[PDB]
Amino acid sequence: SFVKDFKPQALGDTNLFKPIKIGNNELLHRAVIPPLTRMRALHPGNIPNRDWAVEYYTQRAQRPGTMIITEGAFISPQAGGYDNAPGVWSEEQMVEWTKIFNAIHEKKSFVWVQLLVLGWAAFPDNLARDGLRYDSASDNVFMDAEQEAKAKKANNPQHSLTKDEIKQYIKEYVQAAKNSIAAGADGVEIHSANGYLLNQFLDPHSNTRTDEYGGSIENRARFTLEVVDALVEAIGHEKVGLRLSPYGVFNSMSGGAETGIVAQYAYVAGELEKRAKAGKRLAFVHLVEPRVTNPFLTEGEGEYEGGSNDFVYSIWKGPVIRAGNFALHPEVVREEVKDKRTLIGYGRFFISNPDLVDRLEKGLPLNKYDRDTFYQMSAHGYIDYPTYEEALKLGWDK
Numbered sequence: 001s002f003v004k005d006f007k008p009q010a011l012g013d014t015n016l017f018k019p020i021k022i023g024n025n026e027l028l029h030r031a032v033i034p035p036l037t038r039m040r041a042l043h044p045g046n047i048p049n050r051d052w053a054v055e056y057y058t059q060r061a062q063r064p065g066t067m068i069i070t071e072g073a074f075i076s077p078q079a080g081g082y083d084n085a086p087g088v089w090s091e092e093q094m095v096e097w098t099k100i101f102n103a104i105h106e107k108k109s110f111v112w113v114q115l116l117v118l119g120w121a122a123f124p125d126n127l128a129r130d131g132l133r134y135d136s137a138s139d140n141v142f143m144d145a146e147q148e149a150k151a152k153k154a155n156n157p158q159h160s161l162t163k164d165e166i167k168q169y170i171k172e173y174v175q176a177a178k179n180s181i182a183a184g185a186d187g188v189e190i191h192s193a194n195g196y197l198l199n200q201f202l203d204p205h206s207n208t209r210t211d212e213y214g215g216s217i218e219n220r221a222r223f224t225l226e227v228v229d230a231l232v233e234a235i236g237h238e239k240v241g242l243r244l245s246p247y248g249v250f251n252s253m254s255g256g257a258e259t260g261i262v263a264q265y266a267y268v269a270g271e272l273e274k275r276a277k278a279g280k281r282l283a284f285v286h287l288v289e290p291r292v293t294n295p296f297l298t299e300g301e302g303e304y305e306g307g308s309n310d311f312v313y314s315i316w317k318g319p320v321i322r323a324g325n326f327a328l329h330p331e332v333v334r335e336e337v338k339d340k341r342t343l344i345g346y347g348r349f350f351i352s353n354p355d356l357v358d359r360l361e362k363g364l365p366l367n368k369y370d371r372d373t374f375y376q377m378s379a380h381g382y383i384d385y386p387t388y389e390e391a392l393k394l395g396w397d398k
């Protein structure tokens with residue numbers, strides 16, 4: 001069905017439909033597919049889904065010149081811990097990614113691989129089964145009681161990374177980025193948001209370290225910036241973006257309750273701008289809005305009103321992708337895109353609307369999404385959401 005009560009607005013007369021260059025890519029509009037974990041990768045080996053993933057991405061690439069950021073992809077076994085999320089470390093994985101990238105490119109769209117490292121969000125029992133550590137910044141603060149208990153039961157208690165282990169992750173980020181580019185991706189996005197490992201370092205709740213990787217703003221940002229620098233060196237700043245969620249509370253991050261949170265993220269933005277002014281500007285910064293502090297909650301819930309991401313624009317002078325509850329709020333998008341370096345990520349409604357871009361341009365009804373199949377091992381709720389035309393034929397206008 002279409003979303004009931006939604007009053008669409010045609011956005012074709014806004015900058016959402018003005019072209020913009022991101023990295024090497026000439027986007028034809030500024031509606032971005034943000035990274036969306038869908039859990040269709042197959043076990044063993046975290047293999048992108050051999051049956052459906054090409055079709056899923058092909059569908060969502062259908063509007064020419066669309067920027068697509070992939071679902072988070074694990075950079076190594078140790079970075080993982082969900083059996084049905086894909087990786088980008090193995091030949092068998094890259095065989096499938098190559099097909100996906102080729103398909104997106106045939107539709108004249110673009111694809112950026114999100115590089116994911118889970119830290120304390122991983123399942124410790126999966127990791128123990130595979131002989132892997134359960135990692136985070138610290139060893140004395142835990143995501144939640146259930147995770148702590150799972151880790152203990154698995155004889156895999158949460159481990160605070162050594163500097164050498166941080167370096168090993170950086171090596172893996174580098175190789176994952178290389179793999180991505182070699183397989184044909186247009187770039188990579190470093191996931192430093194939503195309470196995964198890099199965010200666990202950024203945030204003073206989760207990072208209680210007293211070495212150079214914690215205990216101050218500069219130190220908490222060090223790992224994220226080392227990954228940035230390593231990837232810029234390896235594949236070029238024009239092929240690297242960074243995702244941050246300053247106000248996020250998902251995965252037990254602090255959000256606005258931490259009075260130092262804006263300073264922490266301002267520091268990161270500043271360091272990116274410093275690199276940019278010195279000749280190495282990242283392709284983009286991707287921000288999750290305080291509009292959605294937890295993407296597991298229905299649109300409108302978990303909105304933080306005590307903060308704005310606008311501060312980033314005073315600091316970072318490059319492209320900014322913003323995501324969070326924009327599909328149902330064209331009136332907000334209309335205002336935000338008046339800024340000429342702002343792009344809009346649409347997550348949940350890109351799950352349910354493969355032709356979302358057409359619908360945004362033309363002010364069409366949106367397909368209701370089905371949360372229950374966000375993470376399912378099925379084509380259903382993955383590749384069988386209809387285009388607007390197909391929905392009319394199904395009688396959804398009624």
Ligand SMILES: Cc1cc2nc3c(=O)[nH]c(=O)nc-3n(C[C@H](O)[C@H](O)[C@H](O)COP(=O)(O)O)c2cc1C
Pocket residue numbers: 034035036037038070071072114191193194243288292295296299323324325326327345346347348349374375
């Ligand atoms: C099912 C689902 C999977 C997601 N997977 C990822 C992910 O892999 N990486 C990431 O950075 N964000 C992920 N997100 C967060 C989204 O990219 C996006 O920021 C969020 O859904 C808010 O935007 P929306 O209101 O347009 O959905 C996910 C969100 C959902 C609902």
Ligand SMILES: C=C(C)[C@@H]1CC=C(C)C(=O)C1
Pocket residue numbers: 037072116193194250294295296
């Ligand atoms: C629905 C979410 C909370 C997403 C699930 C997986 C990843 C990698 C996120 O960044 C958040």
Ligand SMILES: [Cl-]
Pocket residue numbers: 081082083084123126
């Ligand atoms: Cl799992």
Ligand SMILES: [Mg+2]
Pocket residue numbers: 139157158159
């Ligand atoms: Mg210990």
Ligand SMILES: [Mg+2]
Pocket residue numbers: 370372
């Ligand atoms: Mg159902």
Ligand code: NA
Pocket residue numbers: 001367368370
């Ligand atoms: Na449906």
Ligand code: NA
Pocket residue numbers: 051379
């Ligand atoms: Na099938």
